[PDB]
Amino acid sequence: QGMDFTLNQEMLMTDTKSGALFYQEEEALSGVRKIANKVMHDVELVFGYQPEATKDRDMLSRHAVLYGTVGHSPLLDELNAAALIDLTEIAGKREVFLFQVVDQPIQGVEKALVIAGSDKRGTIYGLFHLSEKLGVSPLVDWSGVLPARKESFSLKGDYKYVSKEPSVKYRGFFINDEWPAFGNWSAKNFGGFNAEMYDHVFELLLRLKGNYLWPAMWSARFNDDGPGLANVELADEYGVIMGASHHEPCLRYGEEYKYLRGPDSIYGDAWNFITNREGITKFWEDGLKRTGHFENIITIGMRGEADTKIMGEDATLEDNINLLRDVIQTQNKLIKEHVNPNLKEVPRMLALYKEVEPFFYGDENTPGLINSEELEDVILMLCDDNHGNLRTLPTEDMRKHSGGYGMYYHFDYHGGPVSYEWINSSYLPKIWEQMTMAYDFGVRDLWIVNVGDIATQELPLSFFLDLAYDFDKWGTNAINKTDDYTKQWIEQQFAGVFNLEQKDKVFELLNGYTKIAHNRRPEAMNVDVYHPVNYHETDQLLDRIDHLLGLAEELYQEVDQQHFTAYFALVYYPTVGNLNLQKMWLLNGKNKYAAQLNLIEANKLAEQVKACLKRDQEIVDEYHTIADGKFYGMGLSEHIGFVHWNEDENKNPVLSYVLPVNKPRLLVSIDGTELRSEGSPWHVNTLPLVDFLEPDVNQASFTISSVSEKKAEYHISTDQDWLSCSAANGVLDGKNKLSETIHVFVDRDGLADQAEGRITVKTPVGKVTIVVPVVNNDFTNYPDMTFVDTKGYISIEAEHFATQKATENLDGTLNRFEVLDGYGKTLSAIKAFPTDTHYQVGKDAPFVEYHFVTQEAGVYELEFYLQPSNPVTREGTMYAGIQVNENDVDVINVLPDGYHVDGPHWGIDVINNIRTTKTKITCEQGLNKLRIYAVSPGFALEKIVIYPDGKKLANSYLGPNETYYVGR
Amino acid sequence: QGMDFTLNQEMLMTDTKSGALFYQEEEALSGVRKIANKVMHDVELVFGYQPEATKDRDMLSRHAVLYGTVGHSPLLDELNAAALIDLTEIAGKREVFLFQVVDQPIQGVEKALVIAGSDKRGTIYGLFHLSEKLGVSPLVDWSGVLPARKESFSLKGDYKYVSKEPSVKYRGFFINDEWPAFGNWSAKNFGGFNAEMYDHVFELLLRLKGNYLWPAMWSARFNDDGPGLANVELADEYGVIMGASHHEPCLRYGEEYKYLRGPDSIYGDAWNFITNREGITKFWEDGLKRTGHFENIITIGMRDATLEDNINLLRDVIQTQNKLIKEHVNPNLKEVPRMLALYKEVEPFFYGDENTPGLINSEELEDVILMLCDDNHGNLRTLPTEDMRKHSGGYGMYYHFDYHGGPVSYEWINSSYLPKIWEQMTMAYDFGVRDLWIVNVGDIATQELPLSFFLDLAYDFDKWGTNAINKTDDYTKQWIEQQFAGVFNLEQKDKVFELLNGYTKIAHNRRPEAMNVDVYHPVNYHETDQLLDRIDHLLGLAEELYQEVDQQHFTAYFALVYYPTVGNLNLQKMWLLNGKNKYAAQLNLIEANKLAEQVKACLKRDQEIVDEYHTIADGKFYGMGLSEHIGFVHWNEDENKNPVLSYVLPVNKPRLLVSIDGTELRSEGSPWHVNTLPLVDFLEPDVNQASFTISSVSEKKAEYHISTDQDWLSCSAANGVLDGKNKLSETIHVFVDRDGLADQAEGRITVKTPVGKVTIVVPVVNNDFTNYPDMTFVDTKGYISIEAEHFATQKATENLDGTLNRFEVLDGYGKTLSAIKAFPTDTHYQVGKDAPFVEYHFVTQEAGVYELEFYLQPSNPVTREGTMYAGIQVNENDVDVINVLPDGYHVDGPHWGIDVINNIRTTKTKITCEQGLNKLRIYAVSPGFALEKIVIYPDGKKLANSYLGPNETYYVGR
Ligand SMILES: [Cl-]
Ligand SMILES: [Cl-]
Ligand SMILES: [Cl-]
């Protein structure tokens, strides 16, 4: 073993160093040497002094860093020959490295860290592994995350690590939807979409261990904007594999044809393989000749320009399929002639994006494109629904396909039903659930995510690429570890900046804002999405938001100057931007609702809405000016009040103001409901307050509110000794005191199982009676987790099942429902694992069992709240099993009639981030059992609501909050 | 004849008079002598000097006023015996007077004006006839209308007028819904509902020639609050006949039982004739003993089970009451005026049904007045059939100018409209409702014009009724002259006419408590903007006269014209502006914000105008405007709400909204959404103007560029800029050069904004349509809208006696231009026999099925059958007699309630049209059919929504 490998400041300072730190070989790949220079800059940031590389071995330091690519490093071969390293451990493997400390490697060097890559990208990942061990974040350049300073660093004398091949072969992202943000950012900071800008993109990709990129393509030409070929040449030097979107075949990005087409052009003047066959063919041929020798994946197929359909509305399905078959046969011929005669050596990809997925499978009449011999060895790239929900996935027979499968996922989308492009609104639990399911179904060759303008997507992009790189650490076998991922990601950005308590506050912020944003994405958030009063959903979310904004402002003031930019760009701006916008709309909902009741308190709520809107513009301006405009333009997208799929005609909150009425009237309202009254004997003056119908509830409240600017006295009394309120008398004036909240108290000590009291509220113009029924039976006579109907309905978070039954497989594994912590709109969700089996009731299907007590026998509605997943097969169905008591199991379709991605129901559900389905069941009086069996994949259940046939519950965004269960 | 009768200032002044002006006889009725003292005070107002009365004939002036009641005046009998007057022409007649100048009547008197009444009230009306001749308004005391000063007054030496018996026997009004207004007014000005207060009520009633009153009864007790019997004694002295509403039988007002009932009371403790028969009977007996000897009409009747047993109960109640009246009032029932109210609940007991006889024609109701009522909103309900009109005792009508109840109360300021009153009340007279007319006037204040009219109509139906169609405008001008003679010149008096006629028309289309946001559409057909422009013209006139009126007539102008005009119209304006504010704010237009400030200012003005009303003339009207009246959400004021103001926050980009005026079409110019808008105004050949608007949504400078693609198409602007701060919107006028333009052409306007481009398509029709006859409506816009008076032809039918049945135009009637109705109004016409028709000509674009929609005054059927028919005939095919009422229609039902608050009923039927020229005949069949508008559109087409319906479309000769 010997002594440790050591690096310290003395080693780097000119007065005390013994030699150069890094060794440089003429035989090294140019791109590897460039990454090595980036890592030397990381050393300078950690230690404060610039390290130096040398080509002369006698000029090395006593402790030296020796890096190389196998087959491109005579030194690596010498070390291997002397048996100080064992290159057979990594030779021939894809993107692997050896990271090993070695004793006395050459004369003058006492210890060395050896970094040997199996290939170019393996060496690059190993170099950045050194960066990682020195504490340098992958976002060091992209987000300005400065590493903690060190005086010294050590590794044990026999340190040795051999990485593993990446779990997914091609891994990366797509810069898309790039105007106005990215365009203005690139122009101001770099002069355009040129090699200077792309060097930072390439570095970010490789530091995140990605290897594949779709470049910006809306008003840019990656192959031409280097200037010239400099972008392509730089990518190829670094080993960033270039690709192209679904509509950019044969190495031609989407804007190229616009400049090369014309009436007298060899490429014709029609993006149309039927009428301009020869022009389009020579276009693809010249594209393949121009960049075919660089490292890329060739996209094949043909879609319309700027993400349109290739054919019109009158196009049949066989015509669309007859065309693609013809195009692909032509493209393969071109590739064989001008790229490589051995088609199997050429990576190619066919996107089954949007309308193309129906083209792949076909129908009863049209034997579809699947299993074509022209698709042999081609990657078949499946796509989500543009909103983060997978579509169909490989069947077992499809998983035989040589060439494998890809997945194109979205964190950002410009399109219907509503775009989302401003600030991250994706949530790690959802990403984990969807992308691990894609891996489970055998989608393992290519993963790419649309990240828009990249900014604010750093946490979910890091996760997506860490999942792609090491699926065994973060994937299916690591359920409920995205919280741990987040905390590790916070440590990576903020080590030495924040103490333990501050880092847990950062965790609250990141986990906090992304859960809320994912429940209603920013551009789609608006007034009356959440109900202004029902179930306290608005006020509970406002209180959460106010708690999180408070934490974000504490850390804003505590972070030191050196690390402010990273705190702001990574945590403060995404949190406050999203949550200030949510708050604005939620307050607007309260403002509007109070104004329809002529409540003076509306006017103060309007001023609060106005202040939120002002803060939205202030935080964007701050974002565009920190660190000398490092993020200029990244927050430019219109994002408030969309009324269309895009920003056209979007609208700000409309403020409602009230004019006081003349008489000293007072509105009495029951908190958490729409029940209200001014006490007239001629209209409704008796209100139910039902909170104490659950035996473990000991607090409730109602409010008294001004409608005039006159002084109005109220008097409160109750008609039972066990029932009391926080006040007996008071006065409101419409100027300084506008409302009063009265707390109600029930003394349960010695109270019968059912009781009913009445509160009388006298106002200057009338009298409101509040009826207070109480349940004091605590139902110990039922088992724990028994839900008891006392309010007229039952609402169950799906995780609160009473029992569950798993089934067993041959290998010893189990099929079971699992709780996904924090998943969905509310508490969590349950989902069956393994995720790719089609279960059969009575055979292998697992179940969960809920216990619940009805007041009357009869027909009940059973409503599921489900994640809006899409069917995994081309048959477009999704089933679950339900069994009530001992009746037969009923296998029910949980989708609407005629369901399909891009249809009407799909579009409602994707914006609500929830699907609801209803079925009728017959229950006994008293104790009932409900079993839910998994059948189809994609079934993720968040909440169950049960209520008698024909009853209608108060409307809300989240559904009714959970009702009472024994042991709660 | 000889010399004129003359009265002048010198004959009244202490230094130059020859004697007392009025002669006073000890034999005169004391109530007549009280009214003569009121007329002497009127003489003092006109001439400036107080006249004197004398009991000594030697002390009379050379020219003297001699008044008397036949049978209570020795002097009248002396004049009669000397043949200077002829009392046989008034003797034994009801409420008639002789008003005659006679020469040398008695020694020392050279000329006299003799005023001889046939009875007490005839004498009183004759005395007030003198006040009328001297220019004194009936409102002189009630509203403080001072007469113009005279130096001299003359009548010809042979002047002679004999009045006529009133057309309706009992005529008056009901003070009702009297809290909070009238109760606070009377408390403050008189200390309560006592005889000091009621003296002013009685005088107003008699100066308007009424004779019948239902007193305040919500909390007041007319028979006890005099104090004691002083109100009832005073009414009886004047000859004001007291009555009571339908639930106040046997001279017991509604609040009396509350104070006399109880577990140990001789009257029992339950308003229930079956369980407390003896107690209720004693209660009625003591009621009749207490005031049965005063002049009144006794209400009979008494406000689960079987039809037969309810007839049995009501018959028992009425028999008991008639027996009480015989025993304690007068053994000759026929001498005792009695009234039974035919409400809705009792009506089945009156008619009975197929198997048990009803009270109709029974001995019990013989000689009883049968009082019908409207529907509480000014529309009559059922009316006597031909056989019912033989009923001895006749019929009454209870009509409403004020109502506390559903669907929405109307109690604040007059919202009744003279053409409508005339139409309903002349129809009641035509169906034989002629013995009693009474109107609910609420607190009285601001109801002076329609109450004056209602009682003038009742008194002299030959002058103002069915034979005087389209005279309510003349009535209004004469009323204005009666209040403002000598105050306003002729130009000013026609402005007062625009105010009164203007406000009442607008208030009657949506009554104030029921006015709210989005009743009128914020943009469609310019209905909101046309009403706001009319209101701003009327408010400007009201302010002009407010500043011009003489100080001594200021408070009469304020109470009679200014306050009801501005109160009503400022409230309409506030809600109309609120609808524009709300609509602009949903588009994020910056201009919403100044509209909100405008709404707020209207609300402030409403409070100020009421406060001024309550302070002028030392509080003479204190309390009369107290009733809550804004934004009712229930039938009553509970939980009413003010307008909610919408404010906009500017967006970031310099966007511009382009909108087509008069429609909801709008665009911000995006290529991805709607960016082409039709502007259809020039599809009518005689239209030469149209416009669109460009509006700011941001506070950024935003430039626009306008061009057109046709020589003949042009705009008032080519380039401009808006900034969201000082300049928020611009209206662009569009011009079409029709000289030399083809019969159909189409042009396009392009409006370029910072963020997009909007194309406005401008189709033009330039065909005259001379080839068709005048009054032909031509469909060029996809629908036809016809004001009902624009028929092309009409056909009357002739009765055997030479009279004609025909449609007539009622000028100003209804919600829009006017209405048509067949006269006479009480015939059930039959198509092919006597039914008259009007005929409309219209040209369709294509043959097929069209919807024919009628806009009708919301009248109720006049029979118990609940139906109302009209005939339609298209192109001389088969006449179809259609029911213009909804299925199951009934007063208080759901459709009735919608229609009554909209003040319109719409009905739709399908007709088949040829291509090109079509003829539509509409035949009168049932009574009650008043047609205002007809809209014709292709089957299945939906027109833009509005309150008043689409405005009238092009017709040849327009
Ligand atoms: Cl769907
Ligand atoms: Cl008659
Ligand atoms: Cl009805």
Side-chain angles (χ1 to χ4, degrees), chain A residues 137-240:
Chain A
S137 169
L139 316 175
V140 56
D141 172 86
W142 184 258
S143 302
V145 180
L146 292 173
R149 295 288 304 268
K150 282 171 155 52
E151 290 206 332
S152 190
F153 164 79
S154 300
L155 301 164
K156 185 83 153 182
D158 57 354
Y159 199 95
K160 178 198 192 179
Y161 173 67
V162 178
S163 66
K164 302 172 165 258
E165 279 179 325
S167 312
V168 175
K169 192 175 186 185
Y170 303 112
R171 310 166 305 286
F173 60 82
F174 173 28
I175 306 159
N176 189 217
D177 323 300
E178 70 263 19
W179 284 97
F182 204 91
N184 282 268
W185 174 77
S186 85
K188 185 225 155 93
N189 283 311
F190 307 99
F193 302 88
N194 55 34
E196 282 45 60
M197 185 270 273
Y198 268 110
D199 191 60
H200 301 274
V201 172
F202 300 152
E203 185 185 339
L204 171 67
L205 177 68
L206 292 168
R207 281 185 187 267
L208 300 177
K209 306 173 293 265
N211 62 5
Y212 181 62
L213 176 72
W214 295 357
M217 49 99 99
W218 271 8
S219 87
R221 288 173 295 156
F222 181 82
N223 295 326
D224 303 280
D225 288 347
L229 290 162
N231 294 331
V232 175
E233 295 164 344
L234 187 58
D236 175 78
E237 189 174 23
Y238 281 129
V240 172

Side-chain angles (χ1 to χ4, degrees), chain B residues 500-514:
Chain B
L500 299 181
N501 204 61
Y503 99 76
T504 53
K505 170 81 157 187
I506 290 153
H508 114 301
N509 284 352
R510 186 71 164 207
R511 299 204 202 246
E513 294 92 331

Side-chain angles (χ1 to χ4, degrees), chain B residues 886-897:
Chain B
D887 65 329
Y889 177 89
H890 60 277
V891 172
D892 297 304
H895 297 284
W896 171 85

